[PDB]
Amino acid sequence: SAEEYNERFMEMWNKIHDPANGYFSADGGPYHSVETLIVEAPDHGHESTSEAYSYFLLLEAYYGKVTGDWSKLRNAWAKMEEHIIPTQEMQPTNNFYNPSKPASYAAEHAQPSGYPSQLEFGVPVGEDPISAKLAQTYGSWDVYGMHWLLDMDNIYGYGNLGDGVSTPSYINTFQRGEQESVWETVTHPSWESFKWGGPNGFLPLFTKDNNYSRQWRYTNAPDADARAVQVMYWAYQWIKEQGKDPEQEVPGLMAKAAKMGDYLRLAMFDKYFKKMGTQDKNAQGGKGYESAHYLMSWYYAWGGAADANAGWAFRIGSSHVHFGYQNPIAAMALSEFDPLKPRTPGATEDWATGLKRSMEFYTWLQSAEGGIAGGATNSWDGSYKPHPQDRADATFYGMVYDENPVYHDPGSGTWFGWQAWSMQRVAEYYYLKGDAQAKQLMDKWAPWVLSNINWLEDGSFEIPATLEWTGKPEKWDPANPKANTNLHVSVVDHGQDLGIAAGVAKALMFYAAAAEKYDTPQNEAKEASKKLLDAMWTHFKTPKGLAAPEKRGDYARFFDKVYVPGEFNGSMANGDAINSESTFLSMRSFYLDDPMFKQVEDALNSGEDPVFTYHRFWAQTEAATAYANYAALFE
């Protein structure tokens, strides 16, 4: 029944919202995870992410759907704005920004030891063709987008605006290229007041310059902003399905969603607004949209000098594009659905171009077997180097194929989770529009997944976890696309990642629903969806939601040394040292007081991998909502 699956969702929703289970901080924002000791993208479980906020929106949107009560969604959007979108006071100097000269170039490097990277004021940067028009639209130079990373409990001691106290605290980590794993960062405040770090705060870890100024900067995760917009598209439909009025149920939120998708266009540009196909850092930069790829790149970022003695601000897009970030639902909403169309002239056209280009990108990256390959870069080696001869033909509108876009430790192509996150969105598009390109993609992707799930003796399962890639796609040709017969993927590891299992279930259910509506039924997809969901319910119940144990041998890296320059002498807020003998743990010695830490040490001291059972907000939300989703589609 529908009512049973809806009850499973409600039970989960109740668990997530019961304060005894610890999903939310003192300020009412989701944590990454209930458990504090966890290292993967954030480096503590009581960090939070724009991803978590986007999932908080999803959770409360389904609660609306099921119950008629939209107040939870109103609350979630308000918490997002309050916590994770910098107020004017927190982004105080966007008036310094010059869209004709958006930033100054620094190379990326193949190891963190490459950093700090020299700012090269003789290297041309292209024009930003959107910021001035966004500022005119909204009456403000400020950016309305989520920063990616918060410290919810002030565990690093930065507070906000240099205050050492306020929560959620804006922080950042990753800054030192493709080999800077989550283990190798130095966690630093978004507001750089030179209070901590060295004499010039944390800045000289990252960029070399003659002068260092106090400053603020934020870094967007486009996949999370895109997800927020996707959720609101669905929320609108669900409200209308109840015969209610979105302007009474979620007043102002569609307009704020369309604003966020307006600024999210910054993700569609090369890092330094270089022309597509740029293969020399010295090349004159783009004008207008010459530097647009129209996809959801790895980030956009913006920042500004604290004061007029310095008097600068910057914006950058990203030159790395991973398939796992794309979102045809957000692009279709922002280009076609009136209540979410952004107001800045051009913005509906860019998103229409984005929607098309993203469907070409999934097609271009589809392996012989069905999995989607990593993505592409407009900056080979993060220095606009020449495209290597061994992949020189493998291009997509000027960008070259990259099997592991952005990061290599571990490879960003190797995680199966991206398959599920991004293909769910294609499956939704197939469902919504009966789109032929989406159908063809999913016809090839769905059975590759199904073929690689192992059903276990006890009724449980293992899904694909880790991937290995060989080869390259053919040169993209939208007029005559070639079969990528020399791009291959193998599944080399399986696991019980229930967040990813739920995302597979959802991709499968939308694919099956779409097929029944528009083509021939795909009963195996539908049954596999249901089996996953039922096997999770009957094998992985916990007091806090649905979770499976996981081995984390990677936690040996707590004790790894981290690159810090010889000239750099710094302190963390708790007085931990930042120097050339620092390790991940020695700069995060609060972990010594965490109960789970003793368990890591004891396990590693016994020659064993530690084992944890995690309740990640995004996963518990994905699992909870997958029950509601199935009931909505099939009952």
Ligand X SMILES: OC[C@H]1O[C@@H](O[C@H]2[C@H](O)[C@@H](O)[C@H](O)O[C@@H]2CO)[C@H](O)[C@@H](O)[C@@H]1O
Q: Is 223 one of the annotated active-site residues of the chain?
A: yes
Beta carbon of residue 135, minimum distance to Ca ion (angstroms, whole number): 8
Please give the order of strands across the beta sheet that includes 207-208: 105-106, 117-120, 207-208
Cα–Cα distance measured from residue 501 to residue 626, given in angstroms and rounded to the nearest whole number: 10
Among the candidate windows 128-136, 221-229, 274-282, 370-378, which touches Ca ion by CB under 5 A? 128-136
Report, in angstroms and rounded to the nearest whole number, the Rg of the chain calculated over CA atoms: 23
What CA–CA distance (Å, rounded) separates 557 from 563?
Answer: 13
SS3 18: coil
**Under rule CB under 6 A, which residues in 600-629 are in contact with ligand X?**
616
Using DSSP, state whether 9 is helix, strand or coil.
helix
* CB nearer ligand X, residue 125 or residue 619: 619
By CB under 6 A, is residue 415 in contact with ligand X?
Answer: yes
Instruction: Give me the residues paired with residue 268 across strands.
Output: none
Stretch of 129-137, 192-200, 227-235, 392-400 contacting Ca ion, by CB under 5 A: 129-137
User: CB–CB of 611/495 below 8 Å?
Assistant: no
Contacts to Na ion from residues 402-421, by CB under 5 A: 409
3 state SS of 98: coil
Q: By CB under 6 A, what part of segment 50-109 binds ligand X?
A: 51
CA distance 88 to 90: 5
Q: Which of 4, 18, 40, 349 binds ligand X (CB under 6 A)?
A: 40
Number of CB atoms found within 10 A of residue 74's CB:
17
For Ca ion, which is the closer residue by CB, 140 or 579?
140
Q: How far apart are CA 550 and CA 170, in angstroms?
A: 29
For the bound state, the minimum distance from the C-beta of residue 184 to Na ion, rounded and expressed in Å, comes to: 6
- Looking at the Cβ atoms of 21 and 137, the one nearer to Ca ion is 137
Cα distances from 540 to residues 477, 497, 545, in angstroms, run 46, 11, 8
Q: Which residue has the tokens 């509601």?
A: 628
Check 35, 60, 180, 223 and give the catalytic one. 223
Least separation in angstroms between residue 373's CB and ligand X is 17
Contacting range for Na ion; rule: CB under 5 A; set: 173-181, 203-211, 369-377, 474-482: 173-181
43, 47, 51, 249: the active-site residue? 51
Torsion over CA: 125, 131, 132, 133 (sign): positive
Q: Is 139 in the site for Ca ion (CB under 5 A)?
A: yes
Run of H or E residues at 150: strand 149-151
Based on the shown chain and the rule CB under 5 A, indicate whether residue 179 belongs to the binding site for Na ion: yes
Q: Which is nearer to Na ion, 85 or 235 (CB)?
A: 85
51 counts as catalytic? yes
The smaller minimum CB distance to Na ion, of residues 179 and 589, is found at: 179
Do 544 and 34 contact (CB within 8 A), yes or no?
yes
Q: 28, 346, 417, 471: which one contacts ligand X (CB under 6 A)?
A: 417
Contact partner at residue 139 from Na ion, ligand X, Ca ion, none, CB < 5 to 8 Å by partner kind: Ca ion
Residue 366 annotated as part of some ligand binding site: no
Q: Which residues fall within 8 angstroms of residue 565, CB to CB, at 6 or more apart?
A: 116, 204, 205, 580
Could you tell me the smallest distance in angstroms from the CB atom of residue 289 to Ca ion? Answer: 23
Q: What track of x and - describes contact with Na ion for positions 68 through 97 (by CB under 5 A)?
A: -----------------x-x----------
Catalytic residues: 51, 223
Binding site for Na ion (CB under 5 A): 85, 87, 179, 181, 409
